[PDB]
Design a protein around this ligand. Structure first.
Ligand SMILES: [Mg+2]
Ligand SMILES: [N+]
Ligand SMILES: [N+]
Ligand SMILES: [N+]
Length: 300
């Protein structure tokens, strides 16, 4: 695929650094013809096949391909793609409100009802992606962002599609990647991967959102992976005392070893904790709350 070979500085005024990866750095920029602001992401090419100091073109083109396809208020949008001798430059929607979890770490309190509001936004994004047979494969707090911090009802944006894959019928996909405390058992044990791996991560994220504690985090990387494979987790009374049965049932149906037995995204949107069927089922989320003391310690 051919990307724009022109100098990105002819069309954009770049400024401060918004973040960084191992082979990537993000800068805030302004489009000259419109005056509008975007985020420019500079991705290092490896250029030589035997080099370990960059990203392969195969991986870059996969990410761009997926990004070009998606149009949803809850996922990040691609604007333009530039290429030079060393870098591929992605012009992306500017997402300025920071992480969701650092925004929730500044509130006085947070009920289960208020938390499901933000969770639904995430569920809606994933619902969109899975409807296009796209697995994110990197769902974790760092990648759940806010568009704008200073509005009545902040919008959630899912970012970073560098591990995302379009699910191919006819060829199983196996690989070992991602952050250990957020990856599904099938990733750990080098098994076939599908959309069900995203559902596991949602389970992990919900667990942390309600408690501030990570369900599988061990003292070493190897211990963490072991906990995931064994599905060794507990609803410790120190963290889940004021947590409803429905919230736990929601989590318990996502943290399941067998992917076929795991809850799907269309199911999770139908779950009574997300979509209360009747009566005082709504009262469980409406009344009960998150402990903001143990939660402020997580983002810290
Ligand atoms: Mg991306
Ligand atoms: N332009
Ligand atoms: N198989
Ligand atoms: N445990």
């Amino acid at each position: 695929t051919v990307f724009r070979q022109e100098n990105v500085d002819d069309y954009y005024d770049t400024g401060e650094e918004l973040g960084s990866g191992q082979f990537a750095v993000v800068k805030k920029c302004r489009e000259k013809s419109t005056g509008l602001q975007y985020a420019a992401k500079f991705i290092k090419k490896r250029r030589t096949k035997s080099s370990r100091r960059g990203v392969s073109r195969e991986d870059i083109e996969r990410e761009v391909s997926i990004l070009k396809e998606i149009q949803h208020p809850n996922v990040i949008t691609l604007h333009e793609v530039y290429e030079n001798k060393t870098d591929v430059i992605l012009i992306l929607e500017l997402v300025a409100g920071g992480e969701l979890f650092d925004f929730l770490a500044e509130k006085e309190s947070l009920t289960e009802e208020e938390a499901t509001e933000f969770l639904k936004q995430i569920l809606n994004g994933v619902y969109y992606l899975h409807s296009l047979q796209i697995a994110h494969f990197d769902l974790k707090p760092e990648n759940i962002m806010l568009l704008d911090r200073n509005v009545p009802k902040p919008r959630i944006k899912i970012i970073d599609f560098g591990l995302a894959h379009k699910i191919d019928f006819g060829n199983e996909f196996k690989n070992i990647f991602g952050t250990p405390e957020f990856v599904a058992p099938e990733i750990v044990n080098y098994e076939p991967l599908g959309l069900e791996a995203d559902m596991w991560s949602i389970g992990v994220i919900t667990y942390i959102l309600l408690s501030g504690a990570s369900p599988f985090l061990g003292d070493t990387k190897q211990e963490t992976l072991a906990n995931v494979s064994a599905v060794n987790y507990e609803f410790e009374d120190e963290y889940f005392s004021n947590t409803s049965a429905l919230a736990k049932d929601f989590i318990r149906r996502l943290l399941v070893k067998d992917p076929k037995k795991r809850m799907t995204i269309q199911d999770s949107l139908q779950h009574p904790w997300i979509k209360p069927k009747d009566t005082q089922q709504a009262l469980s989320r409406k009344a009960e709350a998150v402990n903001m003391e143990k939660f402020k310690k997580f983002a810290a």
